[PDB]
Design a protein around this nucleic acid. Sequence first.
DNA 1: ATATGACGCT
DNA 2: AGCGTCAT
Length: 431
Amino acid sequence: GPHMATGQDRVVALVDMDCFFVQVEQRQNPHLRNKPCAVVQYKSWKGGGIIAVSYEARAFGVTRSMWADDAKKLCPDLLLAQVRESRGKANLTKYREASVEVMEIMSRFAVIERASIDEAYVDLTSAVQERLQKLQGQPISADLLPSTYIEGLPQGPTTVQKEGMRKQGLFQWLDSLQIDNLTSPDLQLTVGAVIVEEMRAAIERETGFQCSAGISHNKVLAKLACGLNKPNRQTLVSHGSVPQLFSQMPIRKIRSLGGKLGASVIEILGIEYMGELTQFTESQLQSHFGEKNGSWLYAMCRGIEHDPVKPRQLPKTIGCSKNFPGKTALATREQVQWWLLQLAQELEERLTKDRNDNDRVATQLVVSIRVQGDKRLSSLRRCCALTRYDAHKMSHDAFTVIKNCNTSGIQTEWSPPLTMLFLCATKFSAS
DNA sequence: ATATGACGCT
DNA sequence: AGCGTCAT
Ligand SMILES: Nc1ncnc2c1ncn2[C@H]1C[C@H](O)[C@@H](COP(=O)(O)NP(=O)(O)OP(=O)(O)O)O1
Ligand SMILES: [Mg+2]
Ligand SMILES: [Mg+2]
């Protein structure tokens, strides 16, 4: 009762760009706008692999990881943009740079944690408090929330179109707001949503890109909220909406529960939905999933999560990687050394840019490879000192640290063949 | 035969 | 350190 914390201390948002690489390509090429479109990587094998899909093309069933030749079977008018290729590999610079455009705009409103190339969490607690002093108990007009959904509303006893439903739920939400209570969690969320509308308007105004957002009390709910009404909309998930929302929410939809841990929860406990977790004690959950996971699950199924928005807008590693599938697996020493060089040359370019831009230098080089037949992402990881941003030195050091993995008795030959090379610069210090 | 990035475990 | 997990 009086002493049970409810996880309502923060306002946290997750902003995620809508079909991000497609929007980047559509900005650059007006002929792709308002069309079924996808961004494709390489070309020779089955037309290349799709990595981003416009919402018009999703309506035909086109998805990420689909081959372009297969996507065209679903959607014959599909337009395609190709990822740039440099040094024989995909080169993602255009998207990294568009990401920086978005992150710098968001960083004007609050401290952000970059969570992917296209999304960032926002700790809005301070901004909300400041905005709540300036408002001075004035009601929040629905005009301030033109793209906001209130999860769980409209409800109860009292319209057959999407936007009408949205507005009816928003009116019900606003009409129940205690606007005199500067500490009401629901009011704080609402003001947070007002700020995220402003943030998303600025992103769209200054970049042309549209995005979605979730606003809630923690990162997990904000991320979940964000996807509820993609694209080009934001969703507020209140603490009070959690029981109904979680009562039919598959466990795998919750961030970090999408893999083996979430599958074990389902299998060991005999449950399907996040809300069913409330029936177990914290000790029970810890007994099955370990001390940290059990505690985390106990709170999370009640909508409570305390992972902070870390103040970090820049990645902390800089890495280059390429897979060599099937018959293209690297099978000679010279092949391995040539591709390590291509990777090292792109890495040097990104590192040199990183040092001038962000006043830091990497100090460790991590070399990861995958051998043919191994289902793991990485078969082997070794590291060495990164002392000079010099591609030939880096590629040579990388070969040095992996070269003993070659079981071939022949010098020119590499065995077992390599299906992935990966160079990652890490352990940055200020410069 | 689908390029990366963060963090956990021992 | 080197591998395992989850993610976009
Ligand atoms: N496995 C992957 N491999 C390569 N690139 C990927 C990728 N997953 C995502 N990307 C790249 C391409 C993606 O555009 C970008 C952001 O990924 P999302 O936010 O997960 N998906 P999007 O923003 O496209 O659409 P929406 O959010 O509206 O659903 O990262
Ligand atoms: Mg996205
Ligand atoms: Mg994303």
